[PDB]
Design an enzyme around this catalytic site. Structure first.
Site, PDB file in Angstrom:
ATOM      1  N   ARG A  95       3.536  -3.990  -5.520  1.00  0.00           N
ATOM      2  CA  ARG A  95       3.768  -4.916  -4.416  1.00  0.00           C
ATOM      3  C   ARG A  95       4.795  -4.334  -3.450  1.00  0.00           C
ATOM      4  NH1 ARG A  95       1.184  -8.361  -1.802  1.00  0.00           N
ATOM      5  NH2 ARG A  95       0.343  -8.901  -3.872  1.00  0.00           N
ATOM      6  N   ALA A 335       6.971  -9.976 -11.870  1.00  0.00           N
ATOM      7  CA  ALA A 335       5.774 -10.500 -12.524  1.00  0.00           C
ATOM      8  C   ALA A 335       4.468 -10.159 -11.794  1.00  0.00           C
ATOM      9  CB  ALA A 335       5.904 -12.014 -12.710  1.00  0.00           C
ATOM     10  N   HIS A 337       2.883 -11.101  -8.927  1.00  0.00           N
ATOM     11  CA  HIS A 337       2.899 -10.714  -7.518  1.00  0.00           C
ATOM     12  C   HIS A 337       3.532  -9.341  -7.324  1.00  0.00           C
ATOM     13  CE1 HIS A 337       3.737 -11.168  -3.080  1.00  0.00           C
ATOM     14  NE2 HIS A 337       2.472 -11.526  -3.193  1.00  0.00           N
ATOM     15  N   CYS A 338       4.562  -9.051  -8.111  1.00  0.00           N
ATOM     16  CA  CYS A 338       5.268  -7.778  -8.016  1.00  0.00           C
ATOM     17  C   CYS A 338       4.439  -6.563  -8.414  1.00  0.00           C
ATOM     18  CB  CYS A 338       6.532  -7.813  -8.879  1.00  0.00           C
ATOM     19  SG  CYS A 338       7.791  -8.980  -8.338  1.00  0.00           S
ATOM     20  N   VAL A 339       3.488  -6.741  -9.324  1.00  0.00           N
ATOM     21  CA  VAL A 339       2.686  -5.607  -9.776  1.00  0.00           C
ATOM     22  C   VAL A 339       1.340  -5.455  -9.076  1.00  0.00           C
ATOM     23  CG1 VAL A 339       3.801  -5.626 -12.021  1.00  0.00           C
ATOM     24  CG2 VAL A 339       1.681  -6.918 -11.692  1.00  0.00           C
TER      25      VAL A 339
END
Ligand SMILES: [Cl-]
Ligand code: NA
Length: 353
Positions: A95, A335, A337-339
């Protein structure tokens, strides 16, 4: 003369979703074993909706991923949708270091390009990060897309757009001296207008506890549609996130769209406190990802999980809201969204659509 850009909102149609397969043991110190399986679950759910492009370092890594995916999809029903790319990465935060696709318009012609911002491991907290910083270029190369570089540090998780001119962010992150030391607020907004084509920047305040990104907006507030923002709100007055979330909620209630009309604010719960090694982790339901047919929400083994899912299901009635246990993933301090990072699908015939 000068081109203009457009950054599609996360809910716009996707050509695919990108991921950077995990391998950095340092990201999940002392508890990396469970991580790969979480990515397999995520990749599987995504493959039900669209193409999944995964960055791996070598053939061995691809094999490991395929094995874990086989446990989720024994018959390989969606196997053709998962495409691997030999693209080196330092961390799995696609992300933040991933391809920021935008539509470029110049001289009446439109094309999809990758807007390459700089990455510095959330203010130089990790190292090295040269491969992560190069991901956008290698993706552009793999897909044969033009790339434009801004020279400014920016993580995708630090911004959120409504797809019509608004961009939500936080002062805590975008104004932290550890990102762009030489730049001020005016210069930063100028670059966002220039390279993302947005018209109004909405600055929220501080982020949540245990967050190593210095306040990423994607752990707190997110656009769900053109005029609606969902924001996590803590109801326990004694919790550390109570004050920060309250200030931002009240702030959002005074913010307006380009039409000067008040934005619709939908409250989301915060997960019950999550700890590991005696440290507070940045668990948040706002760190969900919108895919074509599903919305993937991180869950943290508590009664608030179903509440967050139901609220998001209300926000996206045309999609299936699915939870993915991130109890172990969150030790990485990020989490779902970050990955992930969407790849918007640009229709070539603009007059037709
Ligand atoms: Cl929907
Ligand atoms: Na970069």
């Amino acid at each position: 003369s000068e081109p203009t850009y457009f950054m599609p909102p996360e809910w716009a149609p996707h050509a695919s979703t990108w991921l950077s397969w995990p391998h950095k043991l340092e990201s999940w110190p002392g508890k990396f074993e469970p991580v790969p399986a979480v990515f397999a679950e995520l990749a599987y759910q995504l493959s039900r909706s669209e193409t999944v492009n995964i960055n791996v370092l070598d053939d061995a890594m691809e094999a490991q991923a395929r094995e874990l995916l086989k446990e989720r999809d024994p018959e390989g029903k969606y196997a053709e949708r998962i495409v691997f790319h030999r693209i080196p990465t330092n961390d799995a935060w696609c992300r933040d270091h991933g391809p920021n696709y935008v539509i470029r318009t110049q001289d009446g012609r439109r094309d999809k390009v990758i807007m390459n911002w700089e990455y510095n491991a959330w203010g130089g907290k990790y190292e090295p990060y040269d491969d992560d910083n190069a991901v956008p270029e290698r993706v552009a190369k793999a897909q044969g897309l033009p790339m434009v570089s801004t020279g400014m540090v920016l993580e995708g998780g630090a911004i959120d757009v409504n797809g019509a001119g608004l961009l939500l962010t936080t002062t805590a992150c975008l104004l932290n001296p550890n990102r762009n030391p030489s730049l001020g607020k005016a210069e930063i907004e100028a670059q966002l207008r220039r390279y993302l084509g947005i018209e109004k920047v909405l600055w929220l305040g501080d982020g949540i506890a245990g967050d190593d990104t210095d306040g990423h907006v994607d752990d707190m507030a997110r656009f769900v549609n053109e005029n609606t923002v969902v924001i996590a709100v803590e109801e326990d007055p004694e919790d550390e996130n109570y004050k920060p979330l309250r200030e931002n909620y009240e702030l959002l209630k005074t913010m307006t769209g380009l039409d000067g009309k008040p934005l619709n604010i939908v409250k989301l719960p915060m997960p019950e406190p999550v700890y590991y090694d005696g440290e507070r982790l940045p668990a948040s339901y706002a760190n969900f990802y919108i895919a074509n047919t599903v919305v993937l929400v991180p869950t943290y083994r508590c009664p608030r999980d179903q509440q967050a899912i139901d609220i998001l299901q209300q926000c996206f009635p045309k999609r299936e809201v699915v939870g993915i246990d991130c109890s172990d993933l969150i030790w990485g301090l990020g989490a779902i969204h970050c990955v992930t990072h969407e790849e918007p699908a640009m229709l070539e015939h603009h007059h037709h659509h």
